[PDB]
Design a protein around this ligand. Structure first.
Ligand SMILES: Nc1ncnc2c1ncn2[C@@H]1O[C@H](COP(=O)(O)OP(=O)(O)OP(=O)(O)O)[C@@H](O)[C@H]1O
Ligand SMILES: Nc1ncnc2c1ncn2[C@@H]1O[C@H](COP(=O)(O)OP(=O)(O)OP(=O)(O)O)[C@@H](O)[C@H]1O
Ligand SMILES: [Mg+2]
Lengths: 70, 481, 119, 482
């Protein structure tokens, strides 16, 4: 067991106060956890709009890396 | 040493019934539920409810530690086991007494002594109860069955000494069948009950199942609250019951009422319980078994004799002497119909499904003890019963007329039920006797009723919270955000 | 601080809590594991493989028990460090020759300072 | 029944003091706080704390329903009112008793009798207590006030029969001003105290304020735990107190010690209270008041007599007989200094602000009863007292020496305080004795001290939830990230 739990550091609520608290906190939860449906779409990415010198090293370290990083 | 809060260690109809009894007595009530029951009527009806977790009886209601944990957490000072489950578990009764709770039931030793059908036979014999010819002790091998069947004549019943639920019997009608039947009896007695002890009795061909409701004091007073007939049985389990038992001579009634008192007193019994008997086709009464708990069909006795049997259980467990001091006079007649989720058109096979509509009958003479309501789901994890319909009248004829009304009103939709069977049988001349006898018997439904019923057509989230270093588990809908 | 029915509660909420159907966490591919203590590993590779004797704590060298070129055996006393006015013996971890004794009695010394080499 | 959990219906210094007493007694403590006090030390110190809501005392600490509701929700079986607020509201004491709680205080009837100055004067007279010349009855008109002034001679005090904070007294020195002062006093007493009833008493010229600490038993035992002097007053409210009261003859001490017992027995009083007196410049004692609550200044008596007075209050409310059988002998001398947020260079005017630094003195002979710490914020909603510094020594002079030390160490920054006043007065020959007397008196600060102090230089979110049989507000920070 290595999840970080909610801790009541001070105070001792009754079961009904604990239930009210946890229901409120869960309603205040951040919604869906993360946007797992996010999809890669590199069309018109800003790095493709830059002018690069034909001998520019940023062709390797900026342009190519941005296209290839996954 | 008085009940103040009862944990109803059961579910469904009997849980509702006992919660209601507790509220009438002004006691606090605690329900317990398995996860499939988390919205059952008894959970919402009780003053408190505790989750057991688990999806099946073996994971929940049968776990001694879980029931006693719920008792400790709720602060219940008494446990009522209802019927089935742990109600006849003498080790659970002991565990409750050791936990210092009031066990609302008979003593553990009475439970053991009567749950062994051999010791029960010895008790009955000592009590001079009428007895079927049978082997005094378990038969050692098939040849003792051969000897018994030769001496008494076939048919013979071979029974598990610890059997129950109607499974425990195998019938042999010829001496050549005795062997393999005895082997199968031992085999499944071991498999189902953990013990091979098996004994032999005369099988009765068309017996009528008759039982006496007993109220028994811790101070040794005993009262017979009434008699029931339960001979409409689909396998070896009851479907229709009635009180008082009809068409018995006064000699038979007196023999039943006196044998029940004697046998309970020999057993040292206290609490509610029933002495079951079989009435032979020749009219001879013969002892069958003491049932060491509230009966399912107690309501027909409560309606014909004005006694609240669950409140009598509370008084007895409180140790009060009985206020009833003589057998009450049966005032009317009553029927009970078990509304099982079973398809009578399909061999009475259980049929799980949704209760999409449940409209109980009401009005004169009708009592409904329901465990379900519209929107319930009958899963296969538990007994198929939905409700008990109890119909009372001034005479058996009037109670039949009222049953023909009430069963016609009764509407249940979304799963198969035995209601079409109840409707037929309440109209069947075999059950509407000639006024001095009737033709039903313990195998009438399966062998002789003209069956004409058409066959029926996000998870919880657990959050651990730490509170001053205590672990606490909070369960949430899982979709609150 | 939360009040429930007036009760003052102090509640500690994790930064990755996900209750009630979700919560933001670990989005860039974060991993969590038991952090290693800030000490030398001391595992199957053991620091006694080194020839240097190093001061186990900050203190003062109140006694030097060896001299340059002395042969010593594992468990021999090398120096005493007074720290917090308590004396701590620092002892040879291996057999060999005291080869570069760098401290004198009275010298203030820091943790991990090389006291000597046993070569 | 016995106290088991005490709700401290107060704030600040006295709340801390009673919470500490409860923990010494082994009792559970419940604090209550108004919204300005959500970070106050007592809220974090008590075993439980409850929000009252409301921004001011009239919205919070004064609301009977709120205090009793916090008592119900906490399951506190006793209420200690501290001092001020409701501690002398007899109707609150009755409401507590009707709620079935142990009221840690005197009986409602003793409160009601002694709070009326008229009935208090009658009780003192029956007790044969020393009394100032004054009308036994309240006065009806200015004309009998003038008649009194002609009979006894000016100066004369006109006092509201109900009062507080030193504000109920107007002093007439000529005869011609009596009618106007009588009208003004009636009008103001009507506004401030709801009751225009007033009475007339001869005015002492340079009186010394002396009082006896009483602990009194439900079984009728009474003990005088010690005498105390509080003559350093401004606006008729105390600033520096001390114990034992110095420079009294044994005759005066005996008369005070015995009059206090007689008054409390005549009143049927029980609990911890004080009988306050004036000592005239001629040395004549006169009864002034019975204060029915615990005094602010109890600590100097605790230090000199060695009695824990709050725990005596718990014992008395438990109905135990007094374990002290006789008046204890003082062992040293002690001074208390009230650390008000007031600018002594600006007329002691209240000055709210942040307590950006609070370094209390420590070491030999110092006790600190503080209601604040570094990072506290002082608003105007409540009394200006931050803390009480108590300094004890084997003699008056040793306690003065230790006080000069302690007050030189005491550093408070971010708001004005009277610490520069305490530093002056502890070095002032008017307050250092000549050996057998001193020159301070209840108007010395305002009329005779050489004042040389230079003047001092998001909303929470509430959700309403039902849980079975209760309605619960859940109050969260307005920006919870979660
Ligand atoms: N000799 C017999 N002839 C006919 N039917 C019999 C005979 N003995 C028993 N039965 C039938 O067997 C069943 C006897 O009860 P059984 O022990 O099977 O179950 P139970 O009533 O659930 O158990 P228990 O009483 O132990 O709680 C009834 O159906 C009874 O009709
Ligand atoms: N008769 C008097 N002559 C001279 N000075 C007096 C007289 N009465 C009161 N004083 C001065 O006024 C102060 C008022 O003190 P007192 O005890 O009356 O306060 P209070 O706040 O009105 O009391 P409480 O509200 O508790 O009854 C006295 O301490 C003394 O300084
Ligand atoms: Mg006063």
């Amino acid at each position: 067991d290595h999840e970080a739990h909610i801790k009541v550091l001070r105070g001792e609520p009754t079961p009904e106060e604990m239930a009210a608290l946890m229901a409120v906190l869960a309603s205040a939860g951040g919604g869906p956890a993360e946007p797992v449906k996010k999809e890669r779409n590199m069309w018109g990415h800003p790095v493709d709009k830059l002018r690069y010198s034909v001998f520019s090293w940023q062709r390797v370290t900026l342009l190519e890396r941005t296209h290839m990083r996954r | 040493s008085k009940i103040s809060k009862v944990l109803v260690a059961n579910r469904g109809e009997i849980a509702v019934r006992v919660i209601r009894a507790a509220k009438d007595a002004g006691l606090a009530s605690v329900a317990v539920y398995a996860e499939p029951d988390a919205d059952a009527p008894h959970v919402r009806l009780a003053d408190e409810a505790f989750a057991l977790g688990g999806q099946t009886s073996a994971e929940s209601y049968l776990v001694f530690e879980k029931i006693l944990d719920a008792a400790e957490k709720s602060g219940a000072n008494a446990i009522h086991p209802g019927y089935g489950f742990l109600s006849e578990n003498a080790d659970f009764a002991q565990a409750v007494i050791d936990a210092g709770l009031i066990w609302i039931g008979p003593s553990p030793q009475s439970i053991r002594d009567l749950g062994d059908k051999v010791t029960a036979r010895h008790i009955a014999a000592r009590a001079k109860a009428p007895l079927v010819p049978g082997t005094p002790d378990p038969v050692k091998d098939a040849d003792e069955v051969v000897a018994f069947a030769k001496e008494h004549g076939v048919p013979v019943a071979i029974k598990a000494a610890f059997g129950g639920g109607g499974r425990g019997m195998k019938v042999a009608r010829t001496l050549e069948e005795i062997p393999e039947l005895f082997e199968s009896a031992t085999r499944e007695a071991i498999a189902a009950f953990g013990r091979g002890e098996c004994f032999v009795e005369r099988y009765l061909d068309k017996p009528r199942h008759v039982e006496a409701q007993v109220i028994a004091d811790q101070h040794g007073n005993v009262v017979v609250a009434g008699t029931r007939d339960c001979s409409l049985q689909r396998r070896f389990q009851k479907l229709v019951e009635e009180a008082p038992a009809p068409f018995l001579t006064d000699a038979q009634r007196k023999e039943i009422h006196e044998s029940a008192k004697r046998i309970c007193k020999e057993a040292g019994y206290y609490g509610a319980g029933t002495v079951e008997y079989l009435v032979g086709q020749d009219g001879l009464i013969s002892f069958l078994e003491v049932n060491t708990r509230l009966q399912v069909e107690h309501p027909v006795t409560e309606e014909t004799s004005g006694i609240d049997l669950v409140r009598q259980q509370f008084k007895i467990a409180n140790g009060e002497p009985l206020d009833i001091t003589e057998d009450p006079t049966p005032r009317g007649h009553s029927f009970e119909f078990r509304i099982n989720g079973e398809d009578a058109g399909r061999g009475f096979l259980p049929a799980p499904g949704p209760v999409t509509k449940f409209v109980a009958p009401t009005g004169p003479g009708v009592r409904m003890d329901s465990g379900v309501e519209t929107g319930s789901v009958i899963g296969g994890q538990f007994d198929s019963m939905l409700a008990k319909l109890i119909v009372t009248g001034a005479t058996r004829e009037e109670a039949l007329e009222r049953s023909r009304r009430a069963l016609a009103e009764f509407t249940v939709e979304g799963l198969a039920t035995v209601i079409p069977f109840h409707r037929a049988v309440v109209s069947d001349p075999a059950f509407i006797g000639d006024g001095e006898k009737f033709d039903v018997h313990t195998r009438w439904i399966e062998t002789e009723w003209n069956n004409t019923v058409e066959p029926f057509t996000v998870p919880r989230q657990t959050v651990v919270v730490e509170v001053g270093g205590r672990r606490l588990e909070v369960s949430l809908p899982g979709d609150l955000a | 601080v939360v009040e429930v029915g007036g009760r003052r509660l102090e509640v500690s909420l994790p930064g990755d809590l996900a209750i009630g159907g979700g919560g933001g966490a670990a989005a860039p591919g974060v991993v969590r594991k038991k952090p290693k203590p800030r000490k030398r590993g001391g595992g199957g590779a053991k620091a006694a493989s080194g020839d240097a004797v190093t001061a186990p704590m900050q203190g003062t060298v109140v006694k030097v028990a060896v001299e340059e070129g002395q042969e010593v055996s594992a468990g021999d006393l090398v120096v005493v460090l007074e720290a917090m006015k308590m004396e701590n013996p620092v002892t040879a971890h291996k057999d060999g020759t005291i080869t570069g004794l760098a401290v004198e009695a009275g010298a203030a010394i820091t943790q991990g300072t090389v006291i000597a080499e046993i070569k």
